[PDB]
Structures are given as structure tokens and as C-alpha cells.
Amino acid sequence: SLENVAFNVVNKGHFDGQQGEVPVSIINNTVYTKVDGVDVELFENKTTLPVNVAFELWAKRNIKPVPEVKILNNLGVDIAANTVIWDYKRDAPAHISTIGVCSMTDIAKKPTETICAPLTVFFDGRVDGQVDLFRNARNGVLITEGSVKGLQPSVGPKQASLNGVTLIGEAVKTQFNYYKKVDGVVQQLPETYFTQSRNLQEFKPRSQMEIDFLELAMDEFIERYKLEGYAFEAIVYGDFSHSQLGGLHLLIGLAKRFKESPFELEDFIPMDSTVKNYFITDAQTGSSKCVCSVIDLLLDDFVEIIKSQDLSVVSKVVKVTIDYTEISFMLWCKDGHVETFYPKLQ
Amino acid sequence: SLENVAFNVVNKGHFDGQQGEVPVSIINNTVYTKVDGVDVELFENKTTLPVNVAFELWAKRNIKPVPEVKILNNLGVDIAANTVIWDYKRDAPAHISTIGVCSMTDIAKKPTETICAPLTVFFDGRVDGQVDLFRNARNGVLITEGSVKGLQPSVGPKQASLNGVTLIGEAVKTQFNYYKKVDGVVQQLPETYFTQSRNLQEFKPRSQMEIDFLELAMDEFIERYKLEGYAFEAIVYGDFSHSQLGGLHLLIGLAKRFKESPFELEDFIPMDSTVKNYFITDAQTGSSKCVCSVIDLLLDDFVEIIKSQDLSVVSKVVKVTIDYTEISFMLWCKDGHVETFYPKLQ
Amino acid sequence: SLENVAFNVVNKGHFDGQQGEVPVSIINNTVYTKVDGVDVELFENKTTLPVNVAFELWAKRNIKPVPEVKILNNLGVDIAANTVIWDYKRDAPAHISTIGVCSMTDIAKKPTETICAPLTVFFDGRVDGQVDLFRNARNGVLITEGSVKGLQPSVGPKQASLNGVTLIGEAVKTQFNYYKKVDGVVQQLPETYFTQSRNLQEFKPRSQMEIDFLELAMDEFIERYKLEGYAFEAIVYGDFSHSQLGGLHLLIGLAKRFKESPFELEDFIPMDSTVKNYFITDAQTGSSKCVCSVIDLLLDDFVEIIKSQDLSVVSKVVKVTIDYTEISFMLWCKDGHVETFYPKLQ
Amino acid sequence: SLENVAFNVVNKGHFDGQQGEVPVSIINNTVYTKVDGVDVELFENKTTLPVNVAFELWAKRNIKPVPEVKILNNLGVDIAANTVIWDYKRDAPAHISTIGVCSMTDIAKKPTETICAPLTVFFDGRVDGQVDLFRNARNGVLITEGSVKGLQPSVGPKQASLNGVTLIGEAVKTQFNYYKKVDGVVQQLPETYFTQSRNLQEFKPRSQMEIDFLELAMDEFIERYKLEGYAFEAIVYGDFSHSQLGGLHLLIGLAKRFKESPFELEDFIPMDSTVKNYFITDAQTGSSKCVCSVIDLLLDDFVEIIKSQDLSVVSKVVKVTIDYTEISFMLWCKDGHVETFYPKLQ
Amino acid sequence: SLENVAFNVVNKGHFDGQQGEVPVSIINNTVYTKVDGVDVELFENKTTLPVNVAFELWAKRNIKPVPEVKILNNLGVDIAANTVIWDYKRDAPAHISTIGVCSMTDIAKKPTETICAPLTVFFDGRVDGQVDLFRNARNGVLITEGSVKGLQPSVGPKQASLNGVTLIGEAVKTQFNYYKKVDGVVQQLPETYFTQSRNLQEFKPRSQMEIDFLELAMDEFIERYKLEGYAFEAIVYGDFSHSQLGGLHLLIGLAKRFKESPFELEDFIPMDSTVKNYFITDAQTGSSKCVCSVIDLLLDDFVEIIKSQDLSVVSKVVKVTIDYTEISFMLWCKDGHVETFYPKLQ
RNA sequence: UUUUUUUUUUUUUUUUUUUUGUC
RNA sequence: GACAAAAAAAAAAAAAAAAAAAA
């Protein structure tokens, strides 16, 4: 019920299943509640769903550490089992349909029904009974804090999404073992790189090489790590001398430039994905690029990727598996040295 | 609850107090329900209240024969006791606040509380325990289908509103005895004339003189009933010779004209009142009046009213109690005969 | 394209697939077009879908004679193949998802895809190649204007919906042969009674018995067709002596009463179904029933139905297959004569 | 008038009572004005009130230093006399009804009428003629910058709300004297502590003890101020060793932690209150608590409160008068030392 | 088309003229697109225009360095030739109508048509053929990065707007030469002072005297630059010692005050103009002023303006040509020394 | 061009408060 | 209670203007 959902929201901040109702008014795609005789806003609908449905889904969202929405999307997840994954980037639920959560969007009460068989149902190993559900499920993705029996585990990213903020859990476990089943057979998830999912204004180095990049300048860092000939001047640091911005395809370079001169990032597609496209405008020099493929890879991982490839090719499409999906990079080289290295099709 | 109210609406047409919930989606000030997997419209909010609040009030409306909203307004009724009076003319509740109906709209759970003392609370004697409540109410208006011990009744209109349809009840009783209390003392309601509240396109004569007026022409009807010198040419029949419409202040004359030549009635104030102002445009002759005060008095009552007047006065304002309120008419007389007779201030 | 769709609407009345664009403005859930410099309304969204999606679906609706939406719902039809069935009762598309019509609501480009396998897809035989598509479809319903080789036809209702006008076609063929498949096995559709789907204010009789019912009185019609003991006086003609309405479960009775004195019908579920529930209030006697099931059966079929029942049972639930679905009735009898016969659960 | 109100807004920033009109357009719950031929936004409605009414109330808001809305709510103030108290926390007026401000929300033109008698009317002593109005008012709350003859003053908080800015006035007077009348009898306001109404990101210590708390470490501050055994480890600083956050019920601790490690606060009830509940999620350690009562008490005041308690009780509910209202604290002790002390019911 | 525009937005960040369509849903004045089965917000309508029209104008906005909209407004620019100038301050197009951009807002396809003759069309010389259009235009404004044969250039501000960022371009040329034609004859633009259009929180000095002001104290800065007797203690530095704020009509003083003590600047006319009116409340001392006309003049330019005045006047309104428009200041000399000097426009 | 009403983020009075300090 | 000085509210004056209405 909407009133019970709002009662739970005002008493605990999220749906806990308690009994009780509060006066609720819906007006202009917003849910208001009456506290001491005066309306107080509870939830603003930023989604395409009806405001009551969106409010009920937001109240029933998962407040435990859950995988980042990009990881779920790259695994082909279409629905979640008895839970709602909230995409805080879009302020909307990550999946259109739900299983046993909201009657208006529910397609089934349990994930074992026929309708959910073709769908890749996401199962949480922290909830009891879900491992057995995943075992009998035709298609599914399972995450566990430990090891499950009879299935080879794939270690996921260290970080996980918690209440809209991504963190490496210390008091809580944010590292999950990923399992996948496709048409009833347990798939072996490939060995892949993982994006750190960091923020521009809150960039914090996670390795010694990142600290070296942020503290010493261009030439010192290039010579220190034997990174000559990989065009690190433009790919990472970026070029701001021409009207059209060049390179700057690594989030660490964007953070380094922001630390000395802040710019504006227009995210014309506000979602969660491995590769993010931004409308970059340099406020200091005036350099701007309409679309700029930005991927937040670990600097050590990006260096290893750029060093593990053959430099004696004019143009080559580079297939790198990142975040359980194949990211394709454009490579341009001349005289045995790299010129540009950016994700394909931008 | 919203879902419970919608379930009651879809299973009974109105809130019957039975348990059960159905999926509900609110969008564009409208309440939709999912029947057979596809949304079905339930209620479109035409009020200023929140959509869910208005829907809950509409579901809990009174489906029993209740007095017309004009009667309650003329008696000074502000809010009703444990019921909702729905004004179908406005498609909105007839009162801003209620008692024990809608949690957001309630000012009290019982009419005995202090906050309801200054308000004239509408009581329904057909509901058990409400007569005693009206006894203990400082201000209130009570209707009863029968006699009341210790109280002198005031017989109201023969017609009442039954789910938006005004009718003279035959299988149900629609004549009520009105009792009014102000500051804890019982008031004697004045002897009153009552409007018939008939519709133009569904006009039905209720007396012999009405049938004579509807069937016979002007001169025969004027001669038979001795209506010479009372300006019935303009007041009732109406004048269509000039660019400005003349008279037409009785709905019987409007019905007679519509029977032979329909016109447009632009009701710029869609509400229930004893005197209704219309923007009349005669489609045949082109005569138009911006404000035409139309009162639905029984022709017997109007004839008695105009015959009880003193004709030897040039200008005189007549205070006659109609629908439990004083309607002031303007009476112009010349040479001992009436020239015009219309409600004041139009 | 939205502009191309609006151009097709303003040049042909519906989407035909022509090339051209017109200026389009969307505001307040409404689509406007600029004709001679002034905005002209094109489509007011009464659905829960986005206004552009709803407008595109409405323009691409089926203008050819199509089965009534109730028939499709009773047959278990979920989505339509390469066509849109517009539900004019709800002013919304009859199915949530389409095939190759609108990119927003599309789940597949052709009905042969795996996603459409579990869904019962409506195939229209008048379109070339749809019969072969239905043959290879696991679940599907096929309607044809003629015979199909190797398939036994099932004659449907004489009437079909033509732009919301349910009618018996003379210049068009409105009778179709119905074929149903579930899990790749052709089912034999049971022999059914068919509702006429007539209007109350436009009602026309389709048989001699209906004409006699309309013109003859109660007792005369009862004794002419040997209808004693079937409670036709209350079941069909209706009872208006008490405050609660009695019977009136056939549209023939509603039409007969509406002819002599009109009432109010409040359709609290404005959808298309075999059994329709109304909030009937009588403006003459004041009789009112909160819910009243009205079925538009032809009088001959209803009389055969009531004469085929066993009268020596106190209370019995009658399973009748009407409009390809089992319509359930309550049969109450006493002393070997019928007392009540109305659709159960109301 | 709406146009005059908008002219006053664009010419002086608030309704000053000037004469003149400007073009005004209302669309999408927003008021726009035409300046130099292009529409300029003036006010976007965040309230449940109509857009024009909310805009008129916002323009006529009190621009002088006024008591915080929590103080007015705790005193039982229901409606302000001849002024609007704007709640910047909710972006909505603090009171539903007004006196002599907005013709739609007026219940009376002067606070002396019978309707305002049962309500607690807020009288501002800095406006002339209001002291006498408070003297004759049945229920009212009066604030004055100085003494009032015959009335015992009650000193209020050092801070006051000035255009949404809570500050301790230096060029303006923000410390008022509070007088309350209930049923025509002057009430003696109880001795109470006052919340400082500080912000998390803009916090500034207001005492030497707070300076030591922010500057010193944990053990040094605990030992210097003799605060061992009062559970300052979890009550104040907070615990992050578990997945569930512990304590942190004072804004002093939130400020101290945010200084070293910023985190997320989701205000699920965005209103002004003495005790605030937050959806605190620690971004560094991952510790999150569903609800956390945070009160902005002065550290010296809280030390006195916790040292005035009786430690030899297992479980005890502490009644403390803060901001003219009784704040209920839950006290847990073991072995004669405090274990957990948070506001009750959270 | 709408879907083609959304395709261009999601693929390039703005309309580039690429062919292709993406599914689009418009709901609640917001344009959503479906990628990977989930709706993603592309544009939220902040305008008074229709949502689709506003979205297509936003996509076709000028992504090149363009003059600040205040400059265009002061020059009498009414429309733009084959381009859209976006007011990022209002989040709306800078002009009501367009030329060759949006069929909903077009009044002509080319600036040479009759309807655009009375309007001063803004021509961008960087686009091929626009200069020759400006020569043949009756009324228009032309900006070029270089010289124009036979015309006299009028350079504007060293800064320009690039995707909502006001910057002095280094990798791009942001200095333009302005040409104006009225009634078919070229006009000589007067010598003007230019506002720096700097931000409060990003403020950076552009001269040595500005650095001295931001670093030195009040007395030393006044004594070094011989600014005694011109009331720089109040006009620029401000007087936060009374209930009403004193002076503070230069953004440099606002930035200096904000550096040491943050405050609030309520902009009740959120547009782009030479003189900005603010409802400033000092969060430290409590000094507030309803209207604070703040001009972003260079400190050297302001000093020259205030030193070029005649001090032997009781009061005078002086016309200073700033940003190609005549800004009126209020000089308030008294005994031959300035008491206040503030802009009065807006 | 000649009025009227209103306004302007300056100063000076005039009151009415209130705040002090002294008696 | 006077007294001196604050601050506030409400008035008036000093001087240049602005909007609308008239003229």
C-alpha cells in the first residue's frame, strides 16, 4: 500500500515491512506526507513510471552493498529476484520489471515461474534460499560473499554500490564472486579488468603509480615508468592547444587537469556504463570536444594493457574485456609508437 | 489506503469498507487500475485537491438521497459529519473538510470535538446515532425522514440528489425535515419556497399551470389565469426583438423557448445555487444577454409571489425566502402594472 | 517519426506510410500541429503511455474491421502481429506491446522471434503471409474471411469493430473464422453464444422476439412466448419498487426502461468485457443498485439458455460459454420456478 | 494581484506594496515574467498550494530576522498575524493559513476575529500595534527585542532565521523574548536548552569545548574533560567497526568525521525539527544506519545533560526540555556507566 | 525529426546532422530515450516552449564561442541567422524565434526575407556567406574574428561564452569585432566598458590592482591608489555594521567578502545582464539588502569611472556606456566627496 | 512641453519604541 | 523618572532621475 510505504519511509528511510499508515498526497509527480499538519516532500519522481509505482520501488530498493549497475548490465541481467536495484545515476530502477516486489510492475511472484525462465534473473547470495533458486534457474547471475559448492567462482570488482555511493567496504564485504548460467549451463566468466568508478571532484589514488601521476609532472612520470612511445602526452594528460580537444580518455587525466583548472563535464547520457561519453569544455584554454570517451581504468591496468599489445600496426581494433564486457579500442601507430588509444565509435 | 479504495471502487462502484487491494497507477491527475494486464481509467480529478485525496473522497461519497448542495449552502453548512457530500455540478466535494473520512482532509474524527464546534456540522438522521450528536452540537443542521421528539420540523424540498440525479423519490424517500441549531439553540426555519432544480433539455411540468404554459401560446395562457399587467411578456416568455435579451428569468420560459428554438446556455459559474446566471445566446434571433438570472421556481409559486406584491411602487426590492435563503428581486412598476421582475445584482 | 506520423494523420486521417513532415508541438499530454500559423489539436493522450508513443500507436491503428476487444481478451490474445488493436472503449491500445509498429513498445520486429513464442499472437488473415506465420507460431489466434486449408473454421460474431463502430457489415465482411493454437497444437474452439454489443441510446432489435419485447407489455410478452416461472418480470424487465434495484441484467430490459424513462449509467470500469457492471440509479422511482451485471445477449439465445437449465435446484452455478469464455451465472429457484439468474460475483 | 506581486518581486526582491504590473505567465507550476521580450523564471512551486497562491505567499514572506520554524512549531504556533513565515527547509510556508496576507489563504483580516481565537497566533513585537493585539488575544505567541510591561520575558535562542540564513545577529538583533498565552492566561515558558542550528559542511565551533573536540584527538579530549564512563566513544564520535553504524547522535561528531572523511546524508523528511533523522552512509568504511537522530546541541550543554543523569539505572527514558519542547532520550547504562544515549523512538 | 535529433544527441552530444533514429518517450516535460531497455533522460524542459521544440532548439544550439547574451541584448539583437544562441543563465533560447532551425519557431528560412527586415538579425561572420548576408540586411549585428573590408570594427569583450562557460579563449579566439546596421546604414558603436562576467566562487583577478585589492587590507589599498574621498570603504568594500547592507556594488568586493565569510546571493531575476540585482544576506553579521545592484566592472575601469566624475554636485544620475548600452549610476556626493556610487539599471 | 500617483541599494531631521550609561 | 548615546519603526526635507496617467 502507498500509505504503508510512506509510513515505512518516514519511520526508517526505506521499506522495512512495518504496519502503519500516514496521510499521503500525490501532486505534480511528487509524494508529500503530512507531519504535524503541514506537507513534507518525500519523493520526487524522476522516472517514466507512475509516481506511486516509482515511490514504492524506491522505498523497496536494496540498501545492502549491491554490484554496480554497469556490472549487471554487462552481464546481460534483465531482472532481479525479489529485490530492486536502484540506478542512482538515472534516479530510476535499473530494471523495468520486478519479481515479487511491486504489484504494478511484477511479472511473477517467484523467479521459478515460466515467464522468468528466458530472462537472466539476478540472484543475491546474501539472501537465504536464492542459491538453490539460481541452481534450478535456466538463466541467472549469482553473487556471493564466499564460495558456493560445485561452481567455479569469478572474483568481481573490489568496489560495490552502497546506498548510491561506491566504496571498497571495510566494515562490510563489497567483493562478490560472480556466477552465470545461460540456457541451464554454468558459464565460465572471463578474466577481465574492472573500472574503479571514481568521481572527478573526489578522485583518490588507489595505487602508487596513480600517486606518481598526480604528483609529478608529465616528463618525470613518463621517464620514470618507461612509458615513452605510448603517446601518454595526449591519451592521458590530454592536449589543450587546439580548438578541438585531443585525447584525455582516462579519468585520472581529467582529475589531474581539474586539480589545476576546473572544467565542465556535460554528461548527455546520464547512466552507469564502463565507457562514459562527456561533452568536455576546458574553461581555461577553450579546448572542447563534443564527445569524449572516458574510461576509469586503474593506471597500472591501463599501462599493462597498452604495453601488452603489438605496436607495429597502422590501425587496429583492440578487444579488451573490461567489467565483464568487451570494450573495443582504436589504435593508431606510426614508426613503432602509439598515436591515439580511445574506445571505438565514441 | 489508495489500493483498498480502488479495489472497493472496481468491485462495488463505491467504497463499501471491504478488504482487498488492486494495482493502482496515478498519472496526469488520474487514477488507473490494471485489469486483465492493461490499465483501466478509474477517476479523473477535476478538483483542486490531490488526485489520491480526491479519489478517496469520491469513493466515500454519499450514495443515499441527500439534499441538494444549494440547500446546504443556504443553511450555512460548512462541513459534514462522518460523510462526504459530493457536488456533482462542480465534480468536487461540497465541503473543504470532513470528519473521520480522509486522513489528510480530516479536522477531527468525531463531530463532538472542539474544532467542529464553531462550524455548522451537517448531520444525517438516517444514520444511527447522529440525532443525538445533533442534540449535543453547538451548531448543526439535521435532516430526518420522520418526526423528531422535542423538535419542530421544517418540511424541505420534495426533491433530493440521488448519486448526482435530482429526483422526487418514489421507491425511496427524498423529503426531509430540516432542523437547525446555532450557538446551541434551535432556530425556527422560515416558511420558504423551493426551486424545482429541473434541467432545460429534460424539462417536465409538475403542475397544471406548467402544462398550460408549455402547451398553450402566450395570449390564451395570459387570459385564462388572469396574468395581465404583471409583465409576463418579458419576465417569463422573454423578449427577442432587440440585440439584448429581455427577461427570461424563469426556467419554464427558457424550456418553452428551447422546445421551439434551442439556444446555448453558457454557465460561467458551474456551481449549485438558488439563482443561476447564464450567458444566453439565442441562436434564432441573435438576442444575447451576458448575465441572465434564471430561477427554477414553480410557476404556481412565482405567480403567487408576483400577485402578493404591492403594485403602487415605482422601485422596490422584494425580500422573499427561497431555498432557506433570502432572494432579493427588483420590482419596477408603472401605471399600476409590473414592468420587470428579476433577481437583484444579476 | 513523430513529425511524419503527424503529417500522415493530417493528410490521410491515419498512418499510411507516406513521406513528409509537419511542425509538431507537444504540451500537456497533447499533440498539436501548426496549420496556417495556429496550433491545431491532433491527439489528446488518455492512456498511461507517453504522449508521443500513444500518438504513434493511434495513428498506426487498424482501420479495417477487426474483432471486438472483448473477443480477443477472452481468447487469451496478448499482443498483435504487425498491427495495433485500438480499444476505443478505453481510448488506449488493447495490448501493451506490439510487433514492428513502434520502436518504444516493440518487443520484436517479427512474430517468429523467440520472445513472441510464449505470447498468444493475434494473426489477421486479410494480411498476406499471416496465415503461414500463424501456422508456424507456437501460440496464436488467426481470423480469416474465408476457409483455411487443413484447419477447421470456427464462425465468430456477426459484428466487428470498425473504427470503434461495432456493426454488422454489408459493404464489408465482419464475420471471421477463428483458429486458436497453444503450444503448437490447434485447439477446437467451443460453440459459443455471442453478445450483440449494442448501445443503450442507439439500441435496435435484431430478432422478432426482441421486437415483441420492445412493443408488447410485460404480461403479454410473457404469455406469448411461454415465459411463466422464469422470473422474467424481475430478471429481465427489472424491479423498481424498492430502494434497491431488482434484476435488470439484460440490455433488453435497460433499453425498454430507457425508452419510457431514462436513467443514469456510471461505468466505474470503462473497459470492454462480456459482462458489464454498472452503477444504475433510476431517475423515476429512485431505485439504485451499486453494482449490476449487464450482458448484451440476444433475447433468443438468453431464452434458450434459461430454458436449458434444470429448475429443480435451490441454488446452482451455471457455466455458460459466451464470447469464447465461460460466463458464470447464479441460478436461484424455488417451487420449480426460477427466482434469480444473474452473472455471479457481479 | 499576481501581476503587481511579480512587479514587486522584480523591482524590490519581495512584496513591498508598490503599484505597477508586469507581464506574467504561469506554466508547469512555475511563474515566468517577460523581460526584454524573453520569459524569465521568477518562482518554481515546491509546495502543495496552487502556483499563484504559493508565489504570492513567497513574495509576502518575512524578510526580517524571525525565529526558526522549529521554535514556532514547538510553541504550538498555528498561524502568523499579518505576516508569512517561510520555511526554507521545505521551500513552503510554515503555516497553512494566514491573516490578512493572501485572499485565498486568509481565514480572517485581523487576528481579533472569532476564527483566530482558538488558534495560537504568532505576534511579532517589532511590528507596531502587535503587543496590544497579543494582550487581547486568547491564544498567541509574542516575540520582542525588548521588555514588555507587565510580562515576564523568556529569553530565546541566540540565533534566528534571516532570509533562510540561521545566524547570530551582529548588525541585527536575533535574540528575542518569548511570551505565550493559552486560553487568555499567560504561560511561564519552561527553562530550556536551544539547538545551534549549524550546518554539516559550514560548521563552526561556538565554544572552547567544541574547539578542543575538533582539534584534539579522541583520548585526549575524553581524558581532559573528565568524560570517561559516559559512552562518548559511540554516542558522540560514532562507531564504524560494524556494518551497522552506531551512535553519532550529535552534529559535533558528524562535523568531526566529515572534516576527515565526507559521507552521505539522505534527509528523507526534509523539514525543520529539533531532532533530525538521517540516512547516514559512511563512504569510507561502508557503515550505514537506517535511521539516526541527530540533534544540534551545544557540546557544553550536552555534557551538562549527560552529567546530570542518574547512572545507577539499567534502562531509563530521559525527559529534556530543548527548544521549548520535551525531547525524549533513551538512556542505557551498565556497571554504573553510560552505554548508549540517543533520542527515543528515532 | 524528434528521433533523429535524439539520435544525434546520444551519438555526438549535439545535433550534427547525422542520419539515424533512436526510440524517444516524452513525459512530464522531459525527453527520455531507451538504451539497453531502460529510459535515460536526455533533456528536461526549463523553458516556456513545448518540450520537443525546446529539445530540438537545445540540440541545435551554438557549440562555438559566441558573445555573451547580455552583449546581444544590449545591442538590440532580436533573432539569430541560421543558428541558436542558448541562454544558459535562463536555460532557454536567447531569442523567441529562429531562422532556418525549427519549423515550429521559424518565421523565415533565410534572413533576407521580408519578415526579418524589421528585426536586427545576429550574423556570425565565422560561417561562410554570413558577412554578405549582413551587408544586404537592413538591420543586423555582425561579429567577426578579423577585419571586414570597408567596415569599421567595434571589438567587444575579451571573453565569450563557450557551451555556457565564460572564458578568455587561448586555444580559441573569443575576441570579436562588432558591426551594427540600423535601417540600412551602418552605425558607429560607442566606446564602452566591458563587464568581466566573472563568478563569485571562481573569481580570479585580471589586473595588478585587483590582486592588490584581494590581498591588501582596506586602508592600505585605499592609501596606495589615492582613492580617498570616493567612499570605496562602502561602495566596493561594503559596510556590514547596520541592519541594511551598505554598498557592495562591485563583484570584486563581493568575492573578497565571500573569501573570508560566505553569504547568500538570492538572484530574483535569473538572466544575463550588465547589472545584476541580488537579495544579499550576510551570514556573518546579519546585514542584508533587498536590492543590491552589482556590476562586474574591472576595478581599474570602475576607478576611472568614479574619478572622471564631478564631485561638486549634491546628486546626479550619470550615464555610463557599459557593454554597448547606457548604464545609469547614482552619484551621491556631499561636501565634494562621494557618499555612494551604485548602478541603477535592472 | 505641464501636472498627478508611485519608485530609487545617499544623507539630515522628526517622532515611537527599545537598548544601554549616569543621576 | 530625567539624562546621554545607540538600534529599530514610522514621518519630513535635501538633489538627480525613472514608470504610468493626464496636459
Swiss-Prot record, chains A, B, C, D, E:
<protein>
    <recommendedName>
        <fullName>Uridylate-specific endoribonuclease nsp15</fullName>
    </recommendedName>
</protein>
<feature type="active site" description="For uridylate-specific endoribonuclease nsp15 activity">
    <location>
        <position position="289"/>
    </location>
</feature>
<comment type="function">
    <text>Plays a role in viral transcription/replication and prevents the simultaneous activation of host cell dsRNA sensors, such as MDA5/IFIH1, OAS, and PKR. Acts by degrading the 5'-polyuridines generated during replication of the poly(A) region of viral genomic and subgenomic RNAs. Catalyzes a two-step reaction in which a 2'3'-cyclic phosphate (2'3'-cP) is first generated by 2'-O transesterification, which is then hydrolyzed to a 3'-phosphate (3'-P). If not degraded, poly(U) RNA would hybridize with poly(A) RNA tails and activate host dsRNA sensors.</text>
</comment>
<feature type="site" description="Transition state stabilizer">
    <location>
        <position position="289"/>
    </location>
</feature>
<feature type="active site" description="Proton acceptor; for uridylate-specific endoribonuclease nsp15 activity">
    <location>
        <position position="249"/>
    </location>
</feature>
<feature type="domain" description="AV-Nsp11N/CoV-Nsp15M">
    <location>
        <begin position="62"/>
        <end position="187"/>
    </location>
</feature>
<feature type="site" description="Uracil recognition site">
    <location>
        <position position="293"/>
    </location>
</feature>
<feature type="binding site">
    <location>
        <begin position="289"/>
        <end position="293"/>
    </location>
    <ligand>
        <name>uracil</name>
    </ligand>
</feature>
<feature type="binding site">
    <location>
        <begin position="340"/>
        <end position="344"/>
    </location>
    <ligand>
        <name>uracil</name>
    </ligand>
</feature>
<feature type="active site" description="Proton donor; for uridylate-specific endoribonuclease nsp15 activity">
    <location>
        <position position="234"/>
    </location>
</feature>
<comment type="subunit">
    <text>Homohexamer.</text>
</comment>
<feature type="domain" description="Nsp15 N-terminal oligomerization">
    <location>
        <begin position="1"/>
        <end position="61"/>
    </location>
</feature>
<feature type="domain" description="NendoU">
    <location>
        <begin position="204"/>
        <end position="343"/>
    </location>
</feature>
